[PDB]
């Protein structure tokens, strides 16, 4: 039962070395002359200053043309579905990162979560820019609300929410580790179906404006995955009494499930009607990412049959 | 008793016009194609993009010299006291703005609070830069910890915390309005003693490096005061059943008290030993700011005898 740190604790540890990710005894003054988690502070500077960007300084002259005329009915359908879902995710993220930040006892980590929260706000801004630019008013509202029409979308949403609401409802150390694992999956996996879609269009000279935006969001997402990787790993060291077998189990299940559901989504969005990728490929990408992410947090691959990356080209395309 | 909005509400209002600052019924998807609070969204763009800045791109070559040799024992004392306190305030702010953000039901306002939270993180970074630059390692740790020595500082801190902890402990609509009023005072008042100090040094060519930093923090602070002014005013319209007489009373008391305690601080810091301002001036500044701020949230002046600004010159100096 995670007690939320009070605003000022005069009986708080002076030694940065005594800091913990959770359940530490801080003053809650940001004593940033001493850093225990150099990665937390490095990631703050990287997200907050180095990688700063302005959505509206990206030019949206073309895409509205290509949307208006050059895109197939299936290509427009995927565009709507992917943007609707990513809008939902980034919305959940700005809201939920405030729950993590208020529970974390290392100020440098709180700093890194604050910057991540701000990056999620900019993403929300970028999607609003993309739609204000690329499509008409009614279509933009419809895309924001596409869950109101599409039960596969509505369910993806309610499901992601559920895991976060457990921790909000019942803020215990188990529901914390579960929520944190949820965050890592959501940013590990659930963005890269969408990222892959847009980078396909972009390979063939389709929607290069949108794809610029996405390159920045994707640069930010890799920082976010790295932050939560370190938090989960540091959480394992500092709190092994939380990575019980029952949990280490529930992790690998959800991590497999999630790799599944991302594929059932990638396939619903596209339906092999998109010139550049197919239901087979989808499966080899998510399976690939999923292994990686789970191994990067100290677990055995969940799909050993996969070891190459189907789309190794992305790594070079998405670059800025 | 403010129930904290769940992460996704499929029974949430579609019409932006139905949004409320608190106790609204949102989906918690950031439907930013429709804005009800244009000021909230304007303030987000202003804080997040327009006014972006990097503390470390400000040059800190000189100040360490002027600190090392050119500053009186009283001038060094004020420097330590003011920086120690402002470090404490910005720390409280990054932490507490997460409590407001999670309670607010208008996404554009949540967006504006997220950006403010990020600006508070940058301030934390700026103070760490200032001390890493301007003073030696042991002195920097001592300044972060100056509350551990100085009971006037320790009490200022515990007092600000107290008001925030009430709302955290007992998150009801009264403790919400109290906490929110606390935020407005803290950013209205408690920064401008410090701001005034540093701008004095800076007038006489003392610590112009620090003073650059402060100009940026002060530009950010005016955005923050404006945000909470609008929130309190919009809260009055949307929730008059909260600005009871008992509250409207407790407001004017605290607002007067706070103008008092800022002066008892300004005077402890300086002690008329600082060439540029005196215990009399201090009193005419805080009394001036305090009236203004309380009138700007629809109240009668608390010090009518004051109507001019003692230090009208600041407005022009602090500019960038
Ligand atoms: Fe995002
Ligand atoms: Fe993210
Ligand atoms: Fe600040
Ligand atoms: Fe502020």
Residue numbers in the entry:
A (entry chain AAA), B (entry chain AAA): 8 to 327
The authors write:
pmcThe enzyme ribonucleotide reductase (RNR) synthesizes the deoxyribonucleotides needed for DNA synthesis from their corresponding ribonucleotide precursors. Class I RNRs are composed of two proteins, a large α-subunit (R1) and a smaller β-subunit (R2) that exist as homodimers, that combine to form an active heterotetramer. Aquifex aeolicus is a hyperthermophilic bacterium with an unusual RNR encoding a 346-residue intein in the DNA sequence encoding its R2 subunit. We present the first structures of the A. aeolicus R1 and R2 (AaR1 and AaR2, respectively) proteins as well as the biophysical and biochemical characterization of active and inactive A. aeolicus RNR.
Another possibility for the low radical content and poor occupancy for the second iron is that the presence of a reductant (TCEP) during purification may have partially reduced the tyrosyl radical and/or iron cluster. To address this, we purified AaR2 and AaR2_genomic again in the complete absence of reducing agent. We determined the X-ray crystal structures of TCEP free AaR2 and AaR2_genomic to resolutions of 2.15 and 2.10 Å, respectively. Superposition of AaR2 with AaR2_genomic (without TCEP) with their corresponding structures (with TCEP) shows the overall structures are virtually identical, with low RMSD values of 0.22 and 0.25 Å for the AaR2 and AaR2_genomic proteins, respectively. The AaR2_genomic structure (no TCEP) on the contrary showed clear electron density for both Fe1 and Fe2 in the active site. This is a significant improvement from the AaR2_genomic (with TCEP) structure, where the density for Fe2 was much weaker [modeled in at 0.25 occupancy]. The resulting crystal structures showed AaR2_genomic had full occupancy for both Fe1 and Fe2, indicating the presence of TCEP in the purification buffer was in fact affecting Fe2 binding during crystallization. TXRF analysis showed that AaR2_genomic consistently had a higher Fe content, and the activity was double that of AaR2, regardless of whether or not the proteins were purified with a reducing agent. This clearly shows that the intein in AaR2_genomic enhances the incorporation of iron into the mature protein, particularly in the Fe2 site.
